[PDB]
Amino acid sequence: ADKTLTGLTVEESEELHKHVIDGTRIFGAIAIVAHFLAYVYSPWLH
Amino acid sequence: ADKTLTGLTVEESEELHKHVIDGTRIFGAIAIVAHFLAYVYSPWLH
Amino acid sequence: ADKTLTGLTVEESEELHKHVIDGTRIFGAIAIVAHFLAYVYSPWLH
Amino acid sequence: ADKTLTGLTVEESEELHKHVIDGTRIFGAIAIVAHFLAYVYSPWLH
Amino acid sequence: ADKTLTGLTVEESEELHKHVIDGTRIFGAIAIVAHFLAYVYSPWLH
Amino acid sequence: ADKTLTGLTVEESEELHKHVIDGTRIFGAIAIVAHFLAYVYSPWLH
Amino acid sequence: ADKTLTGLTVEESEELHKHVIDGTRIFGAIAIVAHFLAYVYSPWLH
Amino acid sequence: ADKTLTGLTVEESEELHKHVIDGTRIFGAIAIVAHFLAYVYSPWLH
Amino acid sequence: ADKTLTGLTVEESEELHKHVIDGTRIFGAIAIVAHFLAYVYSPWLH
Amino acid sequence: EYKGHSGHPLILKQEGEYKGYSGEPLILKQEGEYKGYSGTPLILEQKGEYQSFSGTPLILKQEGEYRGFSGAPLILKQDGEYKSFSGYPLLLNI
Amino acid sequence: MNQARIWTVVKPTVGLPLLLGSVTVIAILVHFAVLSHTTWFSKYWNGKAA
Amino acid sequence: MNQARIWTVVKPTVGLPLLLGSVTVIAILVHFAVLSHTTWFSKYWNGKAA
Amino acid sequence: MNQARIWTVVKPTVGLPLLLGSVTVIAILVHFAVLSHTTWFSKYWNGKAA
Amino acid sequence: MNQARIWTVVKPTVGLPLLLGSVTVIAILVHFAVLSHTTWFSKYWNGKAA
Amino acid sequence: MNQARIWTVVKPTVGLPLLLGSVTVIAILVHFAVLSHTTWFSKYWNGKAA
Amino acid sequence: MNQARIWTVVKPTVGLPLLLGSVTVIAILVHFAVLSHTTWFSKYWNGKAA
Amino acid sequence: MNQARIWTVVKPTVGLPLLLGSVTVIAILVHFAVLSHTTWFSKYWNGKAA
Amino acid sequence: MNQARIWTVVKPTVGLPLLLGSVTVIAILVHFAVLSHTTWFSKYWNGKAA
Amino acid sequence: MNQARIWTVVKPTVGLPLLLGSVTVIAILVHFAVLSHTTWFSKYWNGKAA
Ligand code: BCL
Ligand code: BCL
Ligand code: BCL
Ligand code: BCL
Ligand code: BCL
Ligand SMILES: CC(C)=CCC/C(C)=C/C=C/C(C)=C/C=C/C(C)=C/C=C/C=C(C)/C=C/C=C(C)/C=C/C=C(\C)CCCC(C)(C)O
Ligand SMILES: CC(C)=CCC/C(C)=C/C=C/C(C)=C/C=C/C(C)=C/C=C/C=C(C)/C=C/C=C(C)/C=C/C=C(\C)CCCC(C)(C)O
Ligand SMILES: CC(C)=CCC/C(C)=C/C=C/C(C)=C/C=C/C(C)=C/C=C/C=C(C)/C=C/C=C(C)/C=C/C=C(\C)CCCC(C)(C)O
Ligand SMILES: CC(C)=CCC/C(C)=C/C=C/C(C)=C/C=C/C(C)=C/C=C/C=C(C)/C=C/C=C(C)/C=C/C=C(\C)CCCC(C)(C)O
Ligand SMILES: CC(C)=CCC/C(C)=C/C=C/C(C)=C/C=C/C(C)=C/C=C/C=C(C)/C=C/C=C(C)/C=C/C=C(\C)CCCC(C)(C)O
Ligand SMILES: CC(C)=CCC/C(C)=C/C=C/C(C)=C/C=C/C(C)=C/C=C/C=C(C)/C=C/C=C(C)/C=C/C=C(\C)CCCC(C)(C)O
Ligand SMILES: CC(C)=CCC/C(C)=C/C=C/C(C)=C/C=C/C(C)=C/C=C/C=C(C)/C=C/C=C(C)/C=C/C=C(\C)CCCC(C)(C)O
């Protein structure tokens, strides 16, 4: 290997990004539920 | 084992996160009580 | 080649910019669809 | 024991935190007196 | 040659400025067209 | 003894604090007089 | 000669300032024209 | 004697503070005159 | 003579301050003129 | 290679002089001393004591030993220990 | 899912705090927007308006 | 609970102050929001309003 | 597509966060602008005005 | 009381000034909030209003 | 076109972000200025005002 | 008086300016608060109101 | 024209960006000032007010 | 006159500029305060109000 | 004229930018103050109001 600017290897950067992708998916799924609840109970889109 | 960017070992990072998780649970528990008190005394959700 | 101010080689800088260009094109593609939907549903340009 | 990220040993960190805990207790105690005085002289909770 | 304050040689600084001048000229051309459209459609200069 | 995080010895840190305590007491004394004059001349507490 | 706080020699400093003086004079000239145009077309000084 | 945290000796610091003290006395005397003038001409304290 | 905190010797600092003093005196002279012009043309002090 | 999703090329591939899009020249070289487009001269030399325009003196010299225009004393003596003005005890550490 | 090597060039101790902070600031701003520009969100908090 | 290794890439002296500070700022913002967009919260502090 | 070498002189850990951050800030500002100077955008959120 | 080791990972010259400063800022914000959203606090300072 | 040597004394990682950022900030400020000081710009966004 | 050792962990060049500065900011804020929420303070500065 | 040695004590990468930025800020401020405190500047942009 | 040793622990290039700057900021604030909460200060600048 | 040695303890690349910047900021503030608290300054820019 050779030094990246940050010092994370390509593999360590990919393992870090798995958490970032999974975090975005979890945030999205919760936000989808929050939008469904906001639709169900607010006058939005009614 | 290998050196990390922050200097903490994986074992030290997991120990630190236990305090973060415990603190988040304590904060959540107190927040739940505060919402219950607010619901009882304020006109919200009535 | 020679060392640069940021430490990235010319090849590394070019491979990085490919993500920036592709990201800009993806952002533009989504933004175009957003403008089309905005037009189809909002009173803008009507 | 080994060098910490901040340089303080476990004993020094614990001795430092004692002042933080005592300080929070002193602040809390004075705040309770201030709330009592406020309750007595202000129309709050009346 | 001698070490510059930024580390870029005079030759490298000139090639960088070529992109800055080109960028300014491109930005100016797009801006000119945008101003022409504003004149044609907005009540400005009417 | 060992080098503190700030480089000040215990004796130096305590001798510094003596100015902070004295300075706080002097500030308090002036502030008390300022409040007395405010009471005597303003409509506060009347 | 001797080292300077900025690492820029006296000759390089005087040559740098030439661009600053010329830039100020060019800014002043354009500004003078802008004020003349503003006077001719706006109600200012009328 | 030992190297201070700032590098100034006790003597150099005391000579520096003389300018701070004198500067404060100069500022204070000027401000006193400004208050006398503001009193004589403004409706304050009248 | 010894290395100062900033690196400027006593002679270099005194020479720099001459430009600061002359710069202030020039700013003052220009400001005095601007005040006279403002007085002659504005209703201030009239 | 970065495959992308938005078609190809993603970057331009030529080498040498930057063939900028907005005609040429892109810059003006200098063979030597900068000449102002606002003409000349640009600089006034310093060759000794700084020439004021605002008369002289420009500074008041101090002999490594200041004495103020508010006279004296400017500081209090301080030896053996700090002297408090607000009485004692002054610390109560453990 | 193709950007994974960004952490070879953006410091994680910078990009992750800025990512989580920015997402949170956006969420706060969207709440304050809907709160300022609807009647019903304020009304939901006011409830019976005791 | 699975993000425990974040402290190997994000400095604790940075993430922990930012986390505790952000939670505090969010709490303050929610209080000010409800305080401005409701009547009962202001009424609670005003009490008898004598 | 010809500026690809900009990353040899501008640090990626600086330019990329500033780029992604600015693009996000611009989008936020454009939303607030349209929200503050139009009626239909607020009307869309208010819906039935329940 | 179980967080005593936080000072081994958070610099005291950072966490302590931020802690003391945050507490003071919160106190100031609470005073300004009550002062703005209540009548009696302002009336207390006015007193006789002479 | 004669200032090309500026990058020998001003760091590209500083001057380039400040240049591109300032130009963008100015464009935003101009749009907000025209939007808040004219009637036709807001009317253009409202369109039919439905 | 028992906190005398805080300067062993908090840098004097940081804590001393931040202390004196914060104290001054509080004093400024208290003067502005009383000035904004009272009549007699403004009345004192107007005096004869000439 | 006699201050040419300022760059020997003030770093060019500091003073030059601050100079150009400050001049641009001053210009922006003067435009906003005249735009707010005059009628004709707004009228010029509004034109026929179509 | 007894604090003279503060410069042995507080960096002059930090505290001394911050002192002069703070004193100036305070003076500016006091002018703006009296200008906003009085009539005679504004009246003095208007003079004859020509 | 007796403070000439200030530059031995205050860095010129800090004190000189702060001095020139502060004096400029002060001038901007004084212009905005007189502009906001007078009629004739606005009238001068408005002229005939044509
Ligand atoms: C969803 C569709 C994909 C897409 C898929 C393709 C395909 C497929 C091809 C290219 C190819 C090209 N792409 Mg691409 N590309 C997109 C976005 C862009 C954008 C942009 C939005 O700014 C740009 C400037 C480019 C640039 C380019 C050129 C380098 C090249 C030749 C132009 C062409 O005919 O394209 C295709 C042109 C059009 C489809 C006409 C409209 C073009 C405009 C400028 C953008 C339309 C975006 C659209 C609204 C996104 C949503 C579409 C819906 C999914 C239906 N792409 C999006 C992300 N691109 C070519 C290539 O490199 O082949 C090897 C090619 O054949
Ligand atoms: C889009 C066209 C290109 C362009 C293409 C050319 C061409 C072609 C030539 C030059 C050449 C020159 N260019 Mg160029 N150049 C542009 C932008 C600029 C700008 C600027 C906008 O401020 C400047 C100052 C310059 C500077 C110069 C001089 C060094 C030189 C002589 C002037 C000239 O011929 O102008 C030409 C420009 C005009 C007379 C007016 C341009 C009007 C508009 C803005 C552009 C043309 C219409 C276009 C279809 C509109 C769409 C723009 C897109 C939205 C980007 N370029 C843009 C980005 N440039 C010459 C050269 O080097 O020859 C060897 C030359 O013949
Ligand atoms: C031409 C205007 C020049 C100027 C040119 C001179 C000259 C010439 C001399 C001095 C000398 C002196 N100057 Mg000088 N000086 C100016 C500004 C100043 C200011 C200030 C504005 O606060 C101060 C405090 C000083 C300080 C001093 C003393 C160190 C010294 C002795 C006083 C004396 O004899 O005064 C005499 C009277 C004055 C200096 C005039 C004071 C009135 C001010 C300047 C009026 C406003 C501006 C005026 C209308 C001119 C137009 C300015 C342009 C628009 C920029 N100068 C400006 C920058 N100065 C003298 C010296 O060294 O003696 C040994 C001397 O011979
Ligand atoms: C003259 C005003 C001086 C002062 C001069 C002295 C003197 C003289 C003595 C002390 C001593 C003491 N001072 Mg002291 N001190 C002042 C301000 C303070 C303040 C404060 C919040 O203002 C505090 C908490 C203290 C603390 C203390 C105690 C450690 C101690 C008394 C113990 C005791 O029996 O306690 C119970 C009694 C008290 C806590 C009362 C302490 C004094 C009060 C608070 C002073 C009020 C000042 C008044 C408002 C304004 C003065 C005018 C100008 C503003 C300067 N000082 C001011 C700056 N102090 C005494 C000691 O024990 O020394 C061995 C002693 O002899
Ligand atoms: C009409 C006049 C106005 C008014 C106008 C002003 C103005 C204007 C100002 C003040 C200022 C102050 N006012 Mg007042 N003030 C009013 C009425 C009040 C009321 C009230 C409930 O009515 C209170 C509580 C106060 C109290 C105070 C202080 C908070 C503050 C001076 C600080 C000081 O002395 O620091 C020095 C510190 C001390 C004296 C404490 C040390 C000595 C003590 C005795 C020792 C024990 C310390 C203790 C154990 C430590 C606690 C540890 C905790 C863990 C933190 N005023 C009235 C309504 N007041 C000033 C200010 O803001 O200063 C910052 C200010 O400028
Ligand atoms: C708001 C209201 C109502 C009222 C406010 C009123 C008010 C107070 C207004 C105040 C206004 C003021 C103060 C305006 C001041 C304006 C000024 C001063 C403008 C200056 C412009 C300077 C320029 C353009 C400099 C360009 C420099 C350049 C290009 C430098 C290039 C350097 C190079 C190439 C390096 C060479 C390296 C090597 C030597 C090795 O070759
Ligand atoms: C306010 C009003 C009314 C009006 C204001 C109007 C106004 C002015 C509007 C202006 C709008 C503007 C200007 C909009 C501009 C938008 C732009 C430019 C969008 C750009 C998007 C870019 C993206 C998405 C980049 C992604 C990069 C990525 C993901 C990079 C990934 C990098 C990696 C993986 C490292 C690889 C390392 C290796 C492996 C090579 O070593
Ligand atoms: C205002 C108005 C009206 C309108 C405005 C409208 C508008 C513009 C809205 C815009 C909204 C936007 C843009 C929203 C975007 C949202 C996004 C993108 C959310 C992303 C969430 C990401 C998460 C949750 C990441 C968690 C990462 C995690 C936990 C990472 C963990 C890492 C670890 C453990 C280290 C590993 C160490 C090792 C293994 C290597 O050793
Ligand atoms: C306020 C109101 C109402 C009204 C008044 C408002 C007001 C006053 C407005 C004033 C507006 C002004 C002043 C506008 C000025 C605009 C300007 C100047 C725009 C300039 C654009 C420049 C660009 C786009 C540069 C791109 C550079 C780039 C991409 C550089 C890339 C470099 C590379 C790849 C080389 C590195 C690799 C190696 C060579 C080493 O190999
Ligand atoms: C708020 C309301 C309504 C009202 C109240 C507002 C209020 C309170 C206002 C207060 C205002 C105040 C306080 C104003 C103060 C103004 C002053 C002090 C101005 C000073 C100007 C100084 C200048 C121009 C200096 C130029 C220096 C220069 C050019 C230096 C050059 C140096 C060089 C060449 C290096 C040489 C290196 C080597 C020696 C080695 O050769
Ligand atoms: C806004 C509304 C409506 C309501 C808000 C209400 C509200 C919340 C108010 C809160 C107010 C608060 C909290 C006020 C607190 C005030 C305090 C704590 C004041 C402290 C003053 C301290 C001083 C003066 C220290 C001087 C130190 C000094 C001079 C140190 C000198 C050091 C030296 C010489 C170095 C020696 C080195 C060597 C020994 C080696 O030689
Ligand atoms: C908002 C409302 C309504 C109300 C608000 C009310 C309110 C809170 C008001 C508060 C006001 C306050 C707090 C005011 C405080 C004012 C003070 C403290 C002024 C101090 C002035 C200090 C000066 C002038 C220092 C000059 C230093 C100098 C010249 C130093 C020179 C140094 C040298 C030569 C170094 C080389 C030397 C070597 C020996 C080494 O060679």
Author numbering:
A (entry chain B), B (entry chain D), C (entry chain R), D (entry chain F), E (entry chain P), F (entry chain H), ...: 2 to 47
J (entry chain S): 4 to 97
K (entry chain A), L (entry chain C), M (entry chain Q), N (entry chain E), O (entry chain O), P (entry chain G), ...: 1 to 50
What do the authors say?
LH2 complexes are oligomers of a basic α/β-apoprotein dimer, each of which binds noncovalently three molecules of bacteriochlorophyll a (BChl a) and one or two molecules of carotenoids. Light energy absorbed by LH2 is rapidly and efficiently transferred via LH1 to the reaction centers, where it is trapped in the primary charge separation reactions. Overall, the cryo-EM maps and the corresponding models of the four LH2 complexes are very similar, all with a ring-like structure in which nine α/β-heterodimers oligomerize to form a nonameric complex. The most unusual structural feature of these four LH2 complexes is the hitherto unknown γ-polypeptide, which partially encircles the LH2 complex toward its cytoplasmic side.
The protein–protein and protein–pigment interactions in the PucA-LH2 are very similar to other standard B800 to B850 LH2 complexes, except for the existence of the γ-polypeptide. Both α- and β-apoproteins in the PucA-LH2 have a single transmembrane helix. The β-apoprotein of PucA-LH2 has a loop on its N terminus, which protrudes from the membrane. The pair of B850 BChls is coordinated by α-His-36 and β-His-40 through their central Mg2+ ions. The orientations of the bacteriochlorin rings are fixed by H bonds between the C-31 carbonyl group of α-B850 and α-Trp-45 (2.9 Å) and between the C-31 carbonyl group of β-B850 and α-Tyr-44 from the neighboring α + 1–apoprotein (2.8 Å). The average distance measured from Mg2+ to Mg2+ within the subunit is 9.5 Å. The average Mg2+ to Mg2+ distance between neighboring dimer subunits is 9.0 Å. Each of the nine monomer BChls sits between two β-polypeptides near the cytoplasmic side of the complex, with its central Mg2+ liganded by α-Cxm 1, as also seen for the LH2 complexes from Rbl. acidophilus and Rba. sphaeroides. The bacteriochlorin ring is tilted by 12° relative to the membrane plane, an orientation fixed by an H bond between its C-131 keto group and α-Arg-26 (3.0 Å). The B850 pairs in PucA-LH2, PucB-LH2, and PucE-LH2 from Rps. palustris have H-bond patterns similar to that in the LH2 from Rbl. acidophilus 10050.
